[PDB]
């Protein structure tokens, strides 16, 4: 009966990334239904500080969208990923930022 739609996830930075510079890291999660979801921004697998969550929205196909974001200073060492858990997945999924 219920729609079961899995999200697709884009990870990206507010500005072109240059190591050592102040930036904002973005995770955009779209296309999921039902709206129950867990979205996490991870620094080297660990939880990041100062994450915000803009208001959930949705579109004409009724599926939901959410922007999770956090300030960060990217470096050549660190690995930033977005971890997304939702019942249309078989298991939590990870999405990698590319600088």
């Amino acid at each position: 009966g219920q729609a079961k739609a899995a999200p697709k996830v884009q990870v990206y930075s507010r500005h072109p990334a240059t190591a050592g510079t102040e930036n904002i890291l973005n995770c955009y999660v779209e296309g999921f239904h039902p709206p129950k979801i867990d979205i996490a921004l991870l620094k080297n697998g660990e939880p990041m500080k100062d994450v915000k969550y803009n208001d959930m929205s949705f579109g004409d196909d009724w599926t939901f969208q959410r922007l999770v974001y956090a300030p960060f200073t990217p470096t050549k060492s660190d690995v930033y990923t977005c971890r997304v858990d939702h019942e249309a997945f078989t298991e939590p999924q990870s999405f990698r930022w590319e600088p």
């Binding site: 507010r14 709206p35 959930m56 949705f58 009724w62 599926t63 922007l67």
Partner: protein, 271 residues
């Protein structure tokens, strides 16, 4: 100069972290300006220009409406659970409505409802009927139609009240709606398996509409370019990327063409 106001309602039967029982967000031209959820139970701004609203009773009047809407949708979720003969559990009720004001002054309006993420019922405002997706929805189609009140009322709201607030909103939001922010482009490359992948990223453009193209010597490589969807930044600007797989040899033949209102001519960008 077209403009839209839209309100999005989400009501769930079992809440979860991030998902209140009831949430209403108002959008002006796709940017948010009012918020209400069932945990704080007050209307609150989401854009600073809402401080220009001169109606003193605006926030308290709209709070009570939202408090009505959450009471009624709790009831609607219950009605639909019995109608569709469902168990108690996680369930979703959703509604979009609003008006558009087009370039020539004409107007459009919409009122769509969705249950469990599928269509349910939607207003055809210019025949004053509803389209039902379902036999379950036809029960609602009949109730609203035989009573004969609701379609005429929403039609009046969409064509009238909604458009009067939109003109007021568009005027208050003048600075934010009209700004232009140039995209900041970087082109990146990666050779894997004697195949070079070229990536174009446009960061921070406003307004939303943008066209991003990969060009081999000025010719569009439409069926070879893989592009992302327009995605929001935290400041109200947007982001988009487009990649192209090429032969490492042809490499200086490729240019990324970004077309956006902030640029007097399309920007050409090489690696």
């Amino acid at each position: 100069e077209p403009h839209s106001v839209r309100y999005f309602h989400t009501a769930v039967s079992e809440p979860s972290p991030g998902v209140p029982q009831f949430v209403s967000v108002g959008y002006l031209d796709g940017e948010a300006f009012v918020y209400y959820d069932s945990e704080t139970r007050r209307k609150e701004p989401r854009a600073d220009w809402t401080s220009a609203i001169d109606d003193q009773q605006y926030w308290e009047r709209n709070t009570r409406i939202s408090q009505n809407n959450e009471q009624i949708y709790r009831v609607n979720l219950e009605t639909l659970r019995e109608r569709y003969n469902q168990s108690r559990g996680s369930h979703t009720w959703q509604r979009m409505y609003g008006c558009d004001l087009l370039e020539d002054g004409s107007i459009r309006g919409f009122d769509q409802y969705g249950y469990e993420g599928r269509d349910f019922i939607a207003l055809d405002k210019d025949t004053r009927t509803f389209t039902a997706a379902d036999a379950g929805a036809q029960i609602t189609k009949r109730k609203w139609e035989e009573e004969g009140t609701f379609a005429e009322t929403m039609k009046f709201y969409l064509e009238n009240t909604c458009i009067e607030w939109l003109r007021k909103y568009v005027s208050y939001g003048k600075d934010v709606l009209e700004r232009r922010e140039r995209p900041e482009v970087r082109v990146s490359g990666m050779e894997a398996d004697k195949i070079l992948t070229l990536s174009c990223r446009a960061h921070g453009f406003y307004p939303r509409p943008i066209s991003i193209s990969w060009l081999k010597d000025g010719v569009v490589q439409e069926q070879e370019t893989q592009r992302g969807s327009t995605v929001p930044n935290s400041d109200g600007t947007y982001h988009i990327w487009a990649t192209i797989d090429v032969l490492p040899g042809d490499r200086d033949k490729y240019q990324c063409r970004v077309e956006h209102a902030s640029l007097p001519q399309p920007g050409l960008f090489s690696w």
